[model samples]
Target: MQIFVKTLTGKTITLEVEPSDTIENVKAKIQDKEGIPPDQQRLIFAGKQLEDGRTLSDYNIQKESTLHLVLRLRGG
Candidate 1:
């Protein structure tokens, strides 16, 4: 299955992964593509935090679905 990933920079990238791929794996893939780190990646869906180790199926996500991954900005 293919998944579309959207970065905080408003860039969308598509990746082909297995349906069994966990959200963490997807995050790692995104980081590899964008040159970011997993700890700095914040994936949000349905207005909730998506922690690592959670599979896409856990969220009821379908194939060829688009996921939004926002980079956390920490400052004051």
Candidate 2:
């Protein structure tokens, strides 16, 4: 499925992902496309933080879903 990931600074990117792909791998893909390291990303969907161990389907994310991406900073 295709998903839209948007950053805090209003930058947005599209990603193609499989339903079973782990959130960790999803972050890796984001890093590959946007140059932001996976460790520095925090993905939010449906007002909840997505866990690295979960899959897209785990959060009920479907095609055309827009996920909010926030920077993983110290105490931010």
Candidate 3:
């Protein structure tokens, strides 16, 4: 499946993924393509935060769906 991951600044990342893929898997893809580490990547789909261990299907993420990627702040 394909989904659109939009950043807070309005940049969109297009990712091709499988339903069986976990949220962390998708985050790794983003990390590879966009350089944001999975630990700092938080995905929000359908107004809910997507958990790392959960599969995309768990949140009902479908093709053409748009997810928001909120970058975690660095350093405390």
Candidate 4:
């Protein structure tokens, strides 16, 4: 299954993943292509926070799903 991720700046990235794919895995792809590390990336879907240890299906997400991506501030 494939999903869409919309960044705060309005840039969008598409990733192909399975229902059983972990959120961490998706973040790794984003990190690879977009240069945002998983620890600095925050993913949200349907108003709920997405966690790394969970799968897409755990959040009731399906193919072609659209989610939001925002970056977090890191310590100095």
Best by TM-score: 3
* Candidate 3 lDDT: 0.92
Give TM-scores for every candidate, taking all chains together and pairing residue i with residue i: 0.83, 0.90, 0.95, 0.93
The candidates, ranked best first by lDDT, are 3, 4, 2, 1
lDDT of 4 by residue, 2-69 (tens): 89999988888899889999999999989988998789988999988899999999999999899899
lDDT: the better of candidates 3 and 4: 3
Model 4 TM-score on a 0 to 1 scale:
0.93
lDDT per prediction? 0.79, 0.90, 0.92, 0.91
- The residue ranges of model 3 lying beyond 4 angstroms of the native Cα positions read none
How would you encode candidate 2's per-residue C-alpha lDDT over 1-76 as one tens digit per residue? 7999998889889999999989998899998998888888899998899999999988899999999999878555
Model 1 lDDT, full chain set: 0.79
Query: How far off is model 2, as Cα RMSD?
Result: 1.6
All candidates: CA RMSD (Å) = 1.9, 1.6, 0.8, 1.2
For model 3, what is the alpha-carbon lDDT of residue 29? 94
Candidate order, TM-score descending: 3, 4, 2, 1
Candidate number with greatest lDDT: 3
Better of 2 and 3 by TM-score: 3
After superposing candidate 4 on the true structure, give the runs of residues whose Cα lies further than 4 Å from its correct spot.
none
The superposed Cα distance between candidate 3 and the true structure at residue 35, in angstroms, equals 0.6
